[PDB]
Symmetry: D2
Subunit: 308 residues, 4 copies
């Protein structure tokens, strides 16, 4: 009833994301993997785990890539969700533009989730590609940014033990400074000022901590696989009508905020985004910080939009 | 409550093992990670997932491996379950007997699980390692053999669709040909003779199939991580008195069978192996397969204990 | 999107069944409750639980009963599953008449629905429902089941009590549903079965547990908390198979075409998007179980004829 | 591991409360059912359900009740949580609550008491007086179940803000019909309006009479408090084993804080019971008038029940 495709499934992120998706997909679904190198090896590895009721499809790659690769054209028949996770800005921009053109040509009513690293710039890029073809729904393009909310939630639960909250709202952007946590809109007696400042700074520059631990080897591969798999399950469950979750995602604001591509709460549904909620009441400190984030996001959209 | 340690966690197989454990461990547990290189990087990677109730520790290795190191001893204090997944025959046998020596000197009352490649050979080596120390409980040494059950369940499920079974018994050994799937002891009308031979053969050489598709660049890693993590849930959940599961494993056989280290069903409890069950009824074809399998397993055991 | 209706929700078992169903139904499901008296209370009592995504409807019955109740006809539009648990030396007659009328009223507007029978004289009431559906003109032999999970629950509990740390998830039970017809197949389960002369006592206990419970109640009532646990599980299995989210294997008092000579035995089946899709053979049994089976079948044969003669 | 005793298990609320507790209790625990009439019928009814790892005990009552029932003295040995459910009004119900706490606390002075008897405003302080005569009284181990309001509040708001859904709604005050004050300003998302929040906040305060009206004066919400009572008990047992630290709203005793000694306020459960008492938090002007009035009514109920003990 649902078909989920992963683009770039033989990488570090794609391998772990694929394993978690297999263990949680509903009965009777189907998977689909694609990569230039390593797809056959990964495909005949998940076919041995029992997981009754799940079928795995497979499409091999090609010697150094050519535009509009023929193999991907037959893999994209009848696909409902595309998880575009491929890359290692200039090099990554071309890869995103190449893939969306091939995938959207066969299936034009599907949903897209962007997981490539500079989400601020590749999300608007994908909007231009769908405009040239002539098919574009603003309610079916989402940029995954749930990783920051996972870091904000963890950092507050370890400071107010044994008081535990499920989630924390985060708005703004998703790169380095455009992330702003709204710690005031959660139940409980917030710890103190001049300590929320240290916690708020940690969430923004938490990425550089992981790459420093690896001594410049890699990045936080395991974190985004968990964050990507959680968000992907939200879309499919809402697609079948088994949920109406309220999540935070980098979406296109139809009016609303002056910035056209802010990261604001939404309500998912059968047809995609269903409701766009206002940010809500915020304090003075979170007001000055938010106004600085919107300015930086403005340039990021334009720079990404210069390419395409 | 319960402390779980994964030795050799920065490898390709052990990285997916740790991620799966963090999402299933009970509230208030602990996770310990150790490897020679790359331990801190994995450590400050899972610490960012929220997962309230779980703490994470780690210990870093050093220059090319030396004998028993202080870093491994400090992490091993008060550890209930040890998962040994580390390696690259003689190269792996030397590594395994070193970690068990250093781990068992600080927590002799723990449960040891073996994940490394020569299962029929590394498991008796660890038992001979513990005897030399002075402490060895035959109910607290298990060799993981759940991958064969996962393969045999999938292959038989594809053939009898839409009939689904939760598990399939597998006895014998682990290497290539000692694996004997007992398809007669499952509920249902088995498809047909002269077809089960191919299915039983596919399970025997399923490992070689993955390496060929990888162009001889590696082996299965995503499938072995799932089996290793699933088995550790049974041991931990039973230790804290929340279940008593019946599993198949490559365990010691005191009395019972003639082979000193056959793989047979057991029942797990608050002290480890508490009840060993007989293999049960079999047919003629499976009896012949088990007769040849026993001969190779006996020879495999002797070679490992010699080392 | 699935519609599940519980007929007789204000009785002793209907209330617990409805409460158990409310917490397990899938998102977007709808629950209907009908009874002659007491339906509004159950309705605007269950509606105050959170249960996001589930709507609760109801239709109150009437005065001393009348045939073809107009409220039931209106409530039966757009229904997928019918869960029929409604009833009070002549206990059989009242229940048979009630079931006949209820099936006649419910199937006249939704012929493509599943019927589940939970009224106690199962062996005689299931062929009554089949014959009524035949009389109407619509009858699907893969969409008519009789719940028989209570005996399996009892057998599993007893055999797990016998063997201390060795647990099994289920136990095959074939035959019928009365006290002489239940026959557990203890040979087709893993492990070293305890001993002879200890299994006969267990089988007798499985057969007489109902009278044990009734007598323990000082002759005042019957088993209601246990009977409501089985119906909820069977209904969950049916709805999840119908929606396409599973294909499980169950034991139920279903029809058989061909196979056994007895028209309405209880054998393992596999459920699918169209109800039953594959009936399986009973399997290999030992000699002691064989002797029970031929005696079990004889009583079931005479049970079926009474129900058919009633119509 | 954990022994849970349900007092009054053969009643309308107790029977359904026991059925839900059998399906959700952790492996390795034990149930204990007691009542004056009908205990044997219920006890040998839940033992047929397999649920491997659970043992069901039983203890019959007596003739028309006598003080200090001997049968209730052996069952009280080893219990870890007591769920007082027996009931029929204030004069009759106060005698029953006073008798059972006296017998149970004399054998198991280190257990948790979860009062579910109907006059929660008046019966909770009564049990405090009973425990003081014996000489053992822990204020962190005595709680009153008032979770049926949060269930009613969440369902009513979620039916008007579709498709926006919240998991819980904070409710404080008391528990009868005027002492309930829901705090609808403390939830995420844009609140609907005014002059409609007034009708919603009022319905939560008069919902009990609506259930009785539908029954034509035959009963009350038996199924609702069974679900509410069973869900609340699971929080306490899990926090005793150390498997959770939930934050819940309950009618507890405050060691200072509010001037009213028995307000309903948020708390944090732990290994020893209540581990933290949290401030109510910011509220709006409209809800400020309701809360100030509610405290005045609550004060009478505490003193009305605390003088019956003498």
């Amino acid at each position: 009833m649902v078909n989920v495709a992963v683009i770039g499934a033989a990488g570090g992120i794609g391998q772990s994301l694929s394993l978690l998706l297999l263990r949680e997909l509903p009965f009777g679904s189907t998977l689909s993997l694609y990569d230039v190198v390593g797809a056959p090896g990964v495909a005949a590895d998940l076919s041995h785990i029992d997981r009754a009721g799940i079928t795995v499809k497979h499409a091999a790659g090609k010697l150094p890539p050519v535009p509009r690769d023929p193999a991907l054209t037959e893999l994209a028949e009848g696909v409902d969700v595309f998880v575009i996770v491929a890359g290692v800005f200039n090099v990554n921009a071309g890869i995103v533009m190449d893939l969306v053109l091939t995938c959207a040509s066969v299936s034009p009513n599907a949903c897209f989730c962007i997981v490539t690293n500079p989400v601020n710039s590749t999300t608007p890029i994908a909007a231009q590609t769908l405009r040239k073809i002539g098919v574009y729904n603003k309610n079916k393009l989402l940029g995954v940014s749930l990783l920051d909310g996972l870091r904000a939630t963890r950092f507050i639960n370890n400071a107010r033990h044994p008081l535990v909250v499920p989630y924390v709202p985060v708005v703004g952007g998703h790169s380095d400074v455009t992330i702003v946590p709204l710690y005031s809109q959660i139940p409980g007696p917030l710890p103190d000022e001049s300590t929320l400042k240290e916690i708020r700074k940690r969430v923004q520059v938490a990425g550089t901590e992981v790459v420093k631990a690896k001594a410049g080897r890699g990045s936080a591969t395991l974190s985004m696989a968990e964050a990507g798999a959680r968000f992907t399950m939200h879309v499919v469950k809402a697609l079948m009508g088994l949920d109406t979750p309220m999540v935070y995602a980098y979406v296109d604001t139809d009016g609303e905020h002056e910035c056209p591509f802010l990261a604001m709460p939404v309500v998912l549904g059968k047809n995609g985004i269903e409701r766009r909620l206002p940010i809500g009441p915020i304090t003075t400190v979170e007001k000055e910080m938010l106004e600085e984030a919107v300015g930086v996001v403005k340039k990021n959209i334009a720079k990404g939009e210069t390419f395409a």
